[PDB]
Amino acid sequence: KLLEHKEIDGRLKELREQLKELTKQYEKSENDLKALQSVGQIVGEVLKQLTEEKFIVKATNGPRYVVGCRRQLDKSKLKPGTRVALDMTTLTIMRYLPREVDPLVYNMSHEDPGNVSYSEIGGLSEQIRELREVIELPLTNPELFQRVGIIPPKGCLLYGPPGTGKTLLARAVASQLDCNFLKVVSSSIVDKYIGESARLIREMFNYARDHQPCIIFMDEIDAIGGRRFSEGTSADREIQRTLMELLNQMDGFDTLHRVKMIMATNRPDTLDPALLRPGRLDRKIHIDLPNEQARLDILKIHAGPITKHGEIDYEAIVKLSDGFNGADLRNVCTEAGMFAIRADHDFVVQEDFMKAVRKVADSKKLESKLDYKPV
């Protein structure tokens, strides 16, 4: 006699499920409707304090408004320069906020470089070891240098010809280390609005200081690091302005606490001597063309995942690979795989690599490795 009992019980349970779903709809509706009647609040930065009921706020890019704290805010928290929200009606402060703004810095922090172990880089053991001495040891174990006495360097620069692994090394450092990491393209930190790039540098340094320990990586620093023109357009004016802003940020009077900084450039010569001065960039790191042994190492790294067939003579490839930058050998592996694709094969043999090396050596004649200069 289970038919009516269990069938109608299932009907009741199904109707209860539909009721809970519909009440979820209603909860969403009433909640967002209650949120609707609210209103936004203007944002601005509290300046000097007159009395315990009178304050001064510059409403961001608006004017400066004399206003008063609402009732509950701890007056101690309303420090000169802190960020607060104001009623759009009475302008009274009703909440202090986390310090500043600029999701640009948010993007430049949450940039994902991917997992790159130091082993994934080849032939740079001295430089890799060198970088960890100025980027990792001070923030991990600051107490060590107290007994050594020597204060840690804050910034150090990577310079070398294109395709030797500078950006790769930076990616590796960002991936493995457990700290706040800022990734900079020196172009995108240069905006057209008057005096906006220097402001952006200031805010990114402030973000680093608030989120200690922090690492700042500025790739292609020569974009703004160029030598200061004596005269020029608004371009020269504001670019040198941003350069001097960054300089004041890292040079001194502020003595950056845990703001260890990294930059890379293909043209260290064009950099202003103010940057290249040792106090800012103490350990200048030259990332040379890989040696024959280093070339074999990186070749082993990038040829690894390839489904090879039979023996592989990396040594002969290294022999024909004269003067190849690191990125070239990755191109060698890619071209060998492409030759295997051409043969329709599902595997790669030594002759594929040999043809690849010849092909990229022919292309090597195009990239005129000029009379290249260091810093």
Partner: protein, 66 residues
């Protein structure tokens, strides 16, 4: 080759070409008549894997052209 405005745009171009989490699935094709002006790092093997030379048409190639 490496007025700093064009230089900065070009640098943005190479950093986009290399890219953190490189290239996702975006392939790029470039055409120039004068390689000698490109030089330092745009011709890097990473950013431009394949350099394809276009020679003056061969005699049989010219016949096919016509």
């Amino acid at each position: 080759k490496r007025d700093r405005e064009v230089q900065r745009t070009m640098l943005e171009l190479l950093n986009q070409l290399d890219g953190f989490q490189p290239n996702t699935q975006v392939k790029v094709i470039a055409a120039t008549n004068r390689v000698d002006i490109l030089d330092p790092a745009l011709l890097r093997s990473g950013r431009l894997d394949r350099k394809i030379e276009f020679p003056m048409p061969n005699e049989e190639a010219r016949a096919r052209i016509m």
